Design a protein around this ligand. Structure first.
Ligand SMILES: [Zn+2]
Lengths: 1340, 288, 66, 251
DNA sequence: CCCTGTCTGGCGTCCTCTCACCTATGATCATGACGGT
DNA sequence: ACCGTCATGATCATATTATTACGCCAGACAGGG
């Protein structure tokens, strides 16, 4: 079955793979993250409650006072979104917090407080998010973009090759906390082990192991095994486990049990290990040279002298053995220090250590942190407990503790946010294991190590920084005042919190201005995974590997949609199905392929769970049950593609659209384009502009409805029902009774957004697309937006294209367009500019907005009123006066003399300089909206009161229409109530509406229903009255302005541009081009029917720039228009619905096993005529991305129309009238106009303004400036022999002021001659070098 | 990657094949967008080291200049002499390859007509004047530069050659990338240079010099091939000999540095004592 | 090398328009160095004719008339 | 200078000089107040660091900052760097009588001429048109001529075709790498807003037509018109200076 | 005393276009609204 | 309805701390066989 707007124009759909998971709501990152941020969240985390429970309770400097936390609450915003964008306020909500003050007594902090106080306090204004997923910061709609950064936890990197220039790789182990001090263990080419803290000075690593109160005996107990030597009657025998001897060449003949096992000069084989462990050999015999370099573990003391025989971690010599042998020790514990197995890295590290106990280690750490100051044991304890071991200054998150347990092969993924002793010891153990040769290092670009922050987490962090500044302030004030007399709003102030969150949402590196000129550009700017910003890398520094697609971007981050230029691969865009995990990683759906059958359950895999399993490719053929029809199937195991067996697979992809993003899944035939041209096509499809009447894509991907509905430019129905009143302003839906609340009677009103300014100066319009009396379903479009049509997504328009070289006018990439295109007004877009005129107060006098202007004509002022502000709807050109404003200046130094002189003349003679607001140079259009903002306490002029009366009548009429049509629906429900149970058929409509609420009826649910509808009537009346008074007091009151500005007049122009030679058009595959000549109709190549082609491209761009998808799109577009022409022929002849049903059914079956399977036998002879009314301008065809329409299907659809099979029609010429040889390719391509127009780039300057510090011309176009004759152009004129051209190019034309006035006089008198002089900026160089101690001069 | 992309663009690429393609193309876009900075900074360093050098005389009055030969790596002759000595003024007068003839005089610009009369006579190599041998204080004389290159004549007195040279080296910086024995090919005559050799017992002329250059000179006089032959190699041929096309003329073992002799006699182990100097390692799998 | 050779010039404006200006200006200041202009970039800085192209006749004239 | 509003956007050097003078006044008052030594030492040390921060900021330990954490720019940072005086105002300057627009093909051209729009032509050639208008006698004062071309009457287009005729212009594509990226043409006036550029010449500029832009410069004086015609004309650059290969090869 | 890791400074592409946005505060006279007579 | 008390906004000098995540490549410096 189909929805009613899907019976308007049902898009033909090729495609073979039956879908199982539809496209999710595309704005779920923004909305779900910010819903996670601000919501009443119990059990501590996440949200604002994490900050308010981690920074509170603020306890004082031993004054026994404490400011603890209860709850919080956000009130309603004072301004809704529309008033906020008009006026210019933040769209914020006040954050009320309930804080409590307790004050303990003396001698008992475990005793009773004498007094508490709990109260409401105001702090900050956090800006809310609109339903589109955007913020309104100062009247401009902004987006905070997700950041891709390093996952907190341990990370074992390997500084490969480059250091020490000898190939010896290093290994470092960076512990990355979520908040606190970093910690980098590493090696050095002497194979010592070095710690460092926050990239500071370097210490040997075991100095922190003493700082955790480990003795050296315990350290060697941890980081090494033991070797036991027993002195038993002969040569100091040894306990020997032969696994340590795997490949070691002994120094003697190892024999045991009277049997020679190992010979001198040979090594111990594995089978000799098997012999020694099979015979269970324990004690062997060593020479005196065997313990010549064995390292003792623990301290041995002589019992007689009380001295130290040998210190811990010391090699043993002959005299040390002679000392400990005669002291009474039979057991000797040493360490095993092999070449391959276990290096003595800990032992060499302890030999570099000067420290000996806990105190000296804490002193050295306190000294490397803060250099050159006296340490104290209390200060060293406090610092080292506040580096890693305190809840305040150090905090791994749950993400950090998960990675730290997972990368150390733990079991519990839950732990504390602080470190411990076992954590650092396991980091050093894993680092030594990686150095020993077992285990692997961790790459950086692997997406199991890249977390995604979003709006909620970053706003929480900035709010937490605001709270730690305010806890500094509260710790200052709380124990330095008189208690009890104050309340907890005199202490805490809202300035740092609001400053922090307002600085983050106002100007950050990630809170950026929304590129809004297209529904696609909105919905793909909100889904952006930027690597830049705070905590990430920078563009001009890094690098190589991060600008490259890793093998685990498959289905998480799009590989082909990224901006080319200085940041490729850093401004990644997130894919279609890619959600975000609980912790912050990326996860993507799969289908659990149990042993034979592809089960239709979806199952979300992360980036590290994907690697262990084995995933089948998306388009693998399966026969109606899930059994894979091949016995070798293409899969990928551990980041590496291969060919696997039938039933060793564990997952299959969901749909074939999931590698790409929503920017590059609206490209039909994506699998035929080379990836560079698909990248450029997706980026230019983002850069489109909305035309005047957007049409549709004939060749789409079926993804248009998700991008249109799941964005916020269309007016989606909330509750379905029957339309009651359509208008260009509003749309009224009457809600069906099986969807309807019992109370609040309810018929919905959609106030559409008519012509208003977007951010990119386009024209964000909404047009109603429903008829009257029409049913609509829940979840359905009512009003099309900009670049939409019937709920689809129509960016550009589809035009008749031919690929042929035509007389050179399409030489490199150019495009040649018939005048039939510009006559049909089909690339005419609507822009809205917002010109502003401020009127301040100078210290020479205030400015005025009077209509009287000095030294202008009356014809220049006839477009103004009596008040000096332009009428609504007068077409102005460049230079017309919109706001007549003159500078209220002068001031002749006051005094009595001038005081009595001003009385004679009176008022102001002519002390008003002209500074009116004018139209910019070279636009046109219509004044559509004028606003007058005025500071309260200043006289409002006549047009200000006129606009106030206009808006007051508009608001009162609009709210009266709200109440009137709403109660019209309510009385129409009342009549439906009174007919059941006591009908008055003809009696009811005579007696008035007041006496419907108080007519009697039987006591049932019907009388209770009457009571409900009555109280809803009366409540809506009183609510109407109070909100009308509130709306009037909002309109009539003054407006906040900048300090020292009287009044602001804003005028909205609506320009209506067109096409010309120089604009940029482009298709959807990377075929760019400046349109080069707008030919007449007659010159176009026509065919043997009569129709001229509209656009003549260039064929030579196809074999080099390998975008072969545009030719398949051209042929399938010609097939679509062939079906549309046959429908137009079968309908223009007024044929009955039977033949239309026949032909539309044949055009909708037409293929292999497909997904569509429609039938027109359930459309009932009236929808088929309206469906053919919508198909007569062409039949829309869906072609999904990697499961598209093959060549034979395009041929069979070109055979259904009577078009030629090869797609090529022979074409005649327009000029000569004789045939082009070798018939050419025509069809329809869907081409987009880009907003790189030519009357926004063109600029010219003879002589304008000049800069102030260096007397050179200004830069830019808005400032009337000149083009930079840069350094390489100076080199290119040195490279010729052009010497006078360069002399006037950098002395006369640019800098020398007397030189250029002599030049201007000489040019207007006909004498081409230059008086050179000196550049004035060289004199600026002399003053800047001379302002140092340097004495630069000019000799002779 | 061991599994290729067997599908072209007219057939459809499936998903994995397009993803491997995107690896290969993202690397190229990152390389161009980061390569352009080094290309521009190279042009800047080059035009600021040049910056001064102006053609300021007409003859420095010298007889020195570099010896332009065709360049040969070991394959077929890569860049011919007419590409290197086109429009550069000769240092001394080139002798015709027959005997002691004044073929061209000693200060003639070699334009296309002179270079064709050089190619007819098969001239070996030209001693030509180079800019690095110019004797002009503070500039380059007009003959030691050469032809104007965009004008047919010699460089004019004045035209800045340092800046056009620096631009011409640094301008192709974008197109550049950023990130057994000898088998003869043709059929000609053998010649050896830097050679000190000896005949072995079998007859193959072995070489007692490491730095020996093996040239293959044709029947006309020009040098068509060149190779480097190590110390102690088995040459199948000798000096001045004629060979066939494809015949192996050299042989050696680079993993075994030959300590071959000049004379014969008996061998004594001087300062070779087993135990300290040398060691006894009887072979496992052979016995010798 | 080319950056060490263009910073080691007998003309400190030529070696100051290029890389580090601090090192070159202190070396030229404490040496009391003097810049007989005589090159292309000194005359692009100071605003006169290039002594290469059309201006080589002008610099011949000025060098002759000293 | 103040920006648009009521406050003064002050430079960084005024912060540096104002701190040196504040500290110097404090040190004169202390040396006057016979303060003790341990800290007159602090006063002179703060003056030393203030002077050292004024001259070359940041060469000493971490550079001082006004707003917000970004360090403020000192005198040596007005000299050095990519944005000092050498590389930004003395080697490369911004230039009057110059224009910029999007290019397009126009294959009817001869290779010594390029298309140039009428609006750019009337803006770049305002003084020549003023001189021509004052020569004929149509107007009197300069003001009258500026009103005439501000209104664009019917007689200034003949004046414009009589100032264009034999007057070359320097077309320049924005990344100029070698000398063939600045070439001089003769204008042919274009109804339109896009520079029409002869196609063969495109292979010299590395200019395709996918959205490119070029700048036009006007040789003002008479020696510069002759240098544009005799050295930099597009007919004169038919061989690349890097070698002997022709650069006007058909693409 | 001649190698040597190690640390510190000094580079890192030109041209153009659009948009928004630059510390906090700690102390007090004087204006301004609220309540008693 | 006039007079006196609490509250709330102007002008004004006071002077600097608890983040890290480039990649060579010269150039100068303390350490040690
Ligand atoms: Zn010379």
């Amino acid at each position: 079955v189909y929805s009613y707007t899907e019976k308007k124009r049902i898009r033909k759909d090729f495609g073979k793979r039956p879908q199982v998971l539809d496209v999710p709501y595309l704005l779920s990152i923004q909305l779900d993250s910010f819903q996670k941020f601000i919501e009443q969240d119990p059990e501590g985390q996440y949200g604002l409650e994490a900050a308010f429970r981690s920074v509170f309770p603020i306890q004082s400097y031993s004054g026994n006072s404490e400011l603890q936390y209860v709850s919080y609450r956000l009130g309603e915003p004072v301004f809704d979104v529309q008033e906020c964008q008009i006026r210019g306020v933040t769209y914020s909500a006040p954050l009320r917090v309930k804080l409590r003050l307790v004050i303990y007594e003396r001698e008992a902090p475990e005793g009773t407080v004498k007094d508490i106080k709990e109260q409401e306090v105001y702090m900050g204004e956090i800006p809310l998010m609109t339903d589109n997923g955007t913020f309104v910061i100062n009247g401009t709609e902004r987006v905070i973009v997700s950041q891709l950064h390093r996952s907190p936890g341990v990370f074992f990197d390997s500084d490969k090759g480059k250091t020490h220039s000898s190939g010896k790789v290093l290994y470092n182990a960076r512990i990355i906390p979520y908040r606190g001090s970093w910690l980098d263990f590493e090696f050095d080419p002497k194979d010592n082990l070095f710690v460092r803290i926050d990239r500071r000075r370097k210490l040997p690593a075991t100095i922190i192991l003493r700082a955790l109160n480990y003795t050296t005996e315990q350290i060697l107990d941890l980081f090494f095994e033991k070797v036991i030597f027993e002195i038993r009657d002969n040569k100091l025998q040894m306990e020997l486990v032969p696994e340590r001897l795997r490949g070691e060449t002994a120094s003697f003949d190892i024999e045991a049990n009277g049997k020679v096992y190992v010979e001198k000069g040979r090594r111990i084989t594995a089978r000799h290990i098997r012999q020694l462990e099979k015979d269970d050999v324990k004690l062997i015999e060593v020479p005196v040279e065997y313990i010549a370099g064995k390292v003792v573990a623990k301290d041995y003391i002589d019992e007689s002298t009380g001295e130290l025989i040998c210190a811990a971690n010391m090699e043993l010599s002959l005299d040390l053995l002679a000392k400990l042998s005669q002291s009474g020790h039979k057991r000797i514990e040493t360490l095993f220090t092999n070449d391959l197995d276990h290096g003595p890295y800990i032992s060499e590290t302890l030999r570099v250590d000067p420290t000996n106990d806990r105190l000296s280690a804490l002193v050295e750490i306190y000294r490397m942190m803060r250099p050159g100051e006296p340490p104290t044991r209390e200060a060293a304890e406090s610092l080292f407990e506040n580096l890693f071991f305190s809840e305040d200054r150090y905090d791994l998150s749950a993400v950090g503790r998960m990675k730290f347990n997972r990368s150390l092969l733990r079991e519990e993924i839950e732990g504390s946010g602080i470190l411990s002793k076992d954590d650092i010891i396991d980091v050093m153990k894993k680092l030594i294991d990686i150095r020993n040769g077992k285990g692997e290092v961790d790459d950086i670009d692997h997406l199991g190590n890249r977390r995604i922050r979003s709006v909620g987490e970053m706003a929480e962090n900035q709010f937490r920084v605001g709270l730690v500044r305010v806890e500094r302030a509260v710790k200052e004030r709380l124990s330095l005042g008189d208690l009890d007399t104050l309340m907890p709003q005199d202490m805490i102030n809202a300035k740092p919190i609001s400053a922090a969150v307002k600085e983050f949402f106002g100007s950050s590196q990630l809170s950026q201005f929304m590129d809004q000129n297209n529904p696609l550009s909105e919905i793909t700017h909100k889904r952006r995974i930027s690597a830049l910003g705070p905590g990430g890398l920078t563009r001009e520094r890094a690098g190589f590997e991060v600008r490259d697609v890793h093998p685990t971007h498959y289905g998480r981050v799009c590989p082909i949609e990224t901006p080319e230029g200085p940041n490729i691969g850093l401004i990644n865009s997130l894919s279609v199905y890619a959600q975000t995990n609980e912790y912050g990683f990326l996860e993507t759906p799969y289908r659990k392929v149990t042993d034979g059958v592809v089960t239709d359950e979806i199952h979300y895999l992360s980036a590290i769970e994907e690697g262990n399993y084995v995933i089948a490719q998306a388009n693998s053929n399966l026969d109606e049950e899930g059994h894979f029809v091949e016995d070798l199937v293409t899969c990928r195991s551990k980041g590496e593609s291969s060919l696997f067996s039938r039933d060793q697979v564990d997952y299959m992809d969901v749909s074939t659209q999931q590698v790409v993003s929503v920017g590059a899944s609206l490209i039909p035939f994506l699998e035929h384009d080379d990836a560079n041209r698909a990248l450029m096509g997706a980026n230019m499809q983002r850069q489109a502009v909305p035309t005047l009447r957007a049409d549709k894509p004939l060749v789409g991907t079926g993804m248009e409805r998700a991008v249109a509905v799941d964005s916020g430019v269309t007016a989606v129905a909330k509750r379905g029902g029957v339309v009651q009143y359509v208008d260009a302003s509003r749309i009224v839906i009457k809600v069906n009774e099986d969807e309807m609340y019992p109370g609040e009677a309810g018929i919905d009103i959609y106030n559409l957004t008519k012509y208003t300014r977007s951010n990119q100066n386009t024209c964000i319009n909404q047009m109603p697309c429903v008829s009257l009396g029409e049913p609509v379903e829940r979840g359905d479009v009512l009003a099309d937006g900009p670049s939409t049509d019937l709920g689809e997504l129509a960016l550009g328009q589809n035009m008749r294209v031919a690929f042929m070289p035509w007389n050179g006018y399409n030489f490199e990439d150019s495009i040649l367009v018939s005048e039939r295109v510009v006559q049909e007004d089909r690339f005419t877009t609507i822009h809205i500019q917002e010109l502003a005129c401020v009127s301040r107060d100078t210290k020479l006098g205030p400015e005025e907005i009077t209509a009287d202007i000095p030294n202008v004509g009356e014809a220049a002022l006839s477009k103004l009123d009596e008040s000096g502000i332009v009428y609504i709807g007068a077409e102005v050109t460049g230079g017309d006066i919109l706001v007549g404003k003159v500078t209220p200046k002068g001031e002749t130094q006051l005094t009595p003399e001038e005081k009595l002189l001003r009385a004679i003349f009176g008022e102001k003679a002519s002390d008003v300089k002209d500074s009116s607001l004018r139209v910019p140079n070279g636009v046109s259009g219509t004044v559509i909206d004028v606003q007058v903002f005025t500071r309260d306490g200043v006289e409002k002029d006549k047009r200000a009161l006129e606009i106030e009366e206009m808006q007051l009548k508009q608001a009162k009429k609009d709210l009266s229409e709200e109440l009137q049509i709403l109660e019209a629906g309510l009385f129409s429900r009342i009549r439906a109530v009174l007919v059941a149970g006591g009908v008055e058929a003809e009696k009811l409509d005579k007696l008035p509406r007041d006496r419907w609420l108080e007519l009697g009826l039987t006591d049932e649910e019907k009388q209770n229903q009457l009571e409900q509808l009555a109280e809803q009537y009366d409540e809506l009346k009183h609510e109407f009255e109070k909100k009308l008074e509130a709306k009037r007091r909002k309109i009539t009151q003054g407006d906040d302005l900048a300090p020292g500005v009287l009044k602001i007049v804003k005028v909205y122009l609506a320009v209506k541009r067109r096409i010309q030679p120089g604009d940029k058009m482009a298709g959807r595959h990377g075929n760019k081009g400046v349109i080069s000549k707008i030919n007449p109709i007659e010159d176009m190549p026509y065919d043997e029917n009569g129709t001229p082609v509209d656009i003549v491209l260039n064929p030579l761009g196809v074999p080099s720039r390998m975008n072969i998808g545009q030719i398949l799109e051209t042929h399938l577009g010609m097939a679509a228009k062939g079906i549309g022409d046959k429908i137009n022929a079968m309908l223009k002849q007024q044929q009955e619905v039977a033949k239309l049903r026949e032909f539309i059914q044949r055009a909708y079956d037409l293929g292999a096993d497909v997904r569509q399977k429609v039938d027109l036998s359930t459309f009932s002879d009236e929808e088929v005529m309206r469906l053919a009314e919508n198909l007569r301008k062409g039949m829309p065809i869906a072609t999904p991305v990697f499961d598209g329409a093959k060549e034979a299907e395009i041929k069979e659809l070109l055979k259904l129309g009577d078009l030629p099979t090869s797609g090529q029609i022979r074409l005649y010429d327009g000029r000569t009238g004789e045939q082009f040889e070798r018939p050419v390719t025509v069809g329809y391509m869907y081409m987009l106009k880009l907003n790189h127009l030519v009357d926004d780039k063109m600029h010219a300057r003879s002589t304008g303004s000049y800069s102030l510090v260096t007397q050179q011309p200004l830069g830019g176009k808005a400032q009337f400036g000149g083009q930079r004759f840069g350094e390489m152009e100076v080199w290119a004129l040195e490279a010729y022999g052009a010497a006078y051209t360069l002399q006037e190019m950098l002395t006369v034309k640019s800098d020398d002021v007397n030189g250029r006035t002599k030049m201007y006089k000489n040019i207007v008198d006909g004498n081409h001659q230059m008086e050179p002089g000196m550049p004035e900026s060289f004199n600026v160089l002399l003053k800047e070098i001379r302002s140092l101690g340097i004495n630069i001069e000019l000799e002779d | 990657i061991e599994t290729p992309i067997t599908a072209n663009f007219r057939e459809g690429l499936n998903v994995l094949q397009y993803f491997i393609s995107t690896h290969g193309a993202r690397k190229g876009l990152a390389d161009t967008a980061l390569k352009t900075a080094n290309s521009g900074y190279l042009t800047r360093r080059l035009v600021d080291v040049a910056q001064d050098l102006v053609v300021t005389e007409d003859d420095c009055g010298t007889h020195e200049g570099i010896m332009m030969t065709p360049v040969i790596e070991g394959g077929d002759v890569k860049e011919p002499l007419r590409d290197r000595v086109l429009g550069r003024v000769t240092a001394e007068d080139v002798l015709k390859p027959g005997t002691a003839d004044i073929l061209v005089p000693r200060n003639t610009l070699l334009h296309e007509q002179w270079c064709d009369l050089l190619e007819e006579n098969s001239v070996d190599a030209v001693k030509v004047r180079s800019v690095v041998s110019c004797d002009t204080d503070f500039g380059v004389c007009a003959h030691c530069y050469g032809r104007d290159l965009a004008r047919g004549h010699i460089i004019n007195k004045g035209e800045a050659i340092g800046v056009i040279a620096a631009q011409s080296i640094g301008e192709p910086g974008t197109q550049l990338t950023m990130r057994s024995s000898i088998q003869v090919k043709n059929k000609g005559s053998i010649k050896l240079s830097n050679v000190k050799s000896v005949v072995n017992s079998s007859g193959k002329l072995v070489i007692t010099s490491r730095n020996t250059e093996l040239k293959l000179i044709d029947e006309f006089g020009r040098t068509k091939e060149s190779y480097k032959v190590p110390y102690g190699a088995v040459l199948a041929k000798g000096d001045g000999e004629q060979v066939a096309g494809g015949e192996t003329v050299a042989n050696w073992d680079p993993h075994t540095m030959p300590v071959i002799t000049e004379v014969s006699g008996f061998v004594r182990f001087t300062d070779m004592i087993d135990g300290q100097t040398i060691t006894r390692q009887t072979d496992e799998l052979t016995g010798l | 090398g080319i950056t060490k050779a263009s910073l080691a010039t007998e003309s400190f404006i030529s070696a100051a328009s290029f890389q580090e200006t601090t090192r070159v200006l202190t070396e030229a200041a404490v040496a009391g160095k003097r810049d007989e202009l005589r090159g292309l970039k000194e005359n692009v800085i100071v605003g006169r004719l290039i002594p290469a192209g059309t201006g080589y006749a002008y610099h011949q004239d000025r060098m002759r008339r000293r | 200078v103040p920006l648009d509003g009521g406050r003064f956007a002050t430079s960084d050097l005024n912060d540096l000089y104002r701190r040196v003078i504040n500290r110097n006044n404090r040190l004169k008052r202390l040396l006057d107040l016979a303060a003790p030594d341990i800290i007159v030492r602090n006063e002179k040390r703060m003056l030393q660091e203030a002077v050292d921060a004024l001259l070359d900021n940041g060469r000493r330990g971490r550079a001082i900052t006004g707003s917000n954490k970004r360090p403020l720019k000192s005198l040596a940072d007005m000299i050095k760097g990519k944005q000092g005086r050498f590389r930004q105002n003395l080697l490369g300057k911004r230039v009057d009588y110059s224009g910029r627009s999007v290019i397009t093909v126009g294959p009817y051209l001869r290779l010594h001429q390029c298309g140039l729009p009428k609006k750019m032509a009337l803006e770049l050639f305002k003084p020549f048109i003023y001189g021509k208008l004052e020569l004929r006698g149509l107007a009197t004062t300069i003001k009258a001529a500026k009103k005439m071309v501000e209104r664009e009457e019917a007689v200034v287009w003949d004046i414009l075709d009589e100032v264009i005729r034999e007057h070359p212009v320097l077309l320049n594509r924005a990344p100029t790498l070698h000398r063939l990226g600045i070439q001089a043409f003769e204008p042919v006036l274009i109804e339109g807003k896009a520079i029409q550029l002869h196609p063969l010449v495109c292979a010299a500029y590395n200019a395709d037509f996918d959205g490119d832009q070029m700048a036009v410069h006007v040789p003002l004086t008479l020696e510069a018109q002759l240098e544009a015609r005799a050295l930099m004309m597009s007919t004169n650059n038919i061989l690349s200076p890097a070698n002997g290969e022709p650069i006007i090869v058909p693409s």
